[PDB]
């Protein structure tokens, strides 16, 4: 009883909280991104908790990848014109050898890092565009279906250890 369109709507809400809590973590480990510091979130919800929890439990792993992803984004030099094209290529390659919850979370992580990188280089007002990259890639390339088949994003609250 979980549609792919419902999963897509939930993905927007999950990603907003993911971005907020991930940035809050990074800034307590570089100048803050005020678009993330003040990002409006829906009132406390299960989907908001999904985003927060996935940012928190991935914190140690994400920190170990900081230098690698920040450097590769500097090499990639994404712009407003080509960001979606690169995002699609990268996300396609991420899931071509399989889908699992960790790789789903990695796509959220890349969305966060891409959004932060372009902001740091002067591209304001783009967080909605990147959120759309994440939501639409998952919806249009059957990742939303993969999530729905597991009961939707709420299933991610069982990730832990």
């Amino acid at each position: 009883s979980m549609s792919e369109e419902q999963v897509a709507q939930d993905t927007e809400e999950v990603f907003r909280s993911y971005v907020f809590y991930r940035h809050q973590q990074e800034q307590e480990a570089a100048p803050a991104d005020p678009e993330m510091v003040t990002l409006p979130l829906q009132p406390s919800s299960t989907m908001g908790q999904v985003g927060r929890q996935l940012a928190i439990i991935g914190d140690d792993i994400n920190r170990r990848y900081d230098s690698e992803f920040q450097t590769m984004l500097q090499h990639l030099q994404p712009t407003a014109e080509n960001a979606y094209e690169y995002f699609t290529k990268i996300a396609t390659s991420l899931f071509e050898s399989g889908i699992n919850w960790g790789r789903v979370v990695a796509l959220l992580g890349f969305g966060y890092r891409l959004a932060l990188h372009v902001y740091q280089h002067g591209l304001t007002g783009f967080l909605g565009q990147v959120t759309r990259f994440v939501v639409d890639f998952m919806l249009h390339h059957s990742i939303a279906r993969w999530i729905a088949q597991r009961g939707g994003w709420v299933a991610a609250l069982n990730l832990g250890n």
């Binding site: 992803f69 991420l94 960790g102």
Partner: peptide, 24 residues
């Protein structure tokens, strides 16, 4: 390799580490 290829590789590596650690 091109930066986008290396990014995808490291996302797979990161994701599979996350999965091994947190997917029961």
């Amino acid at each position: 390799m091109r930066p986008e290829i290396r990014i995808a590789q490291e996302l797979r590596r990161x994701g599979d580490e996350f999965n091994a650690t947190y997917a029961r």
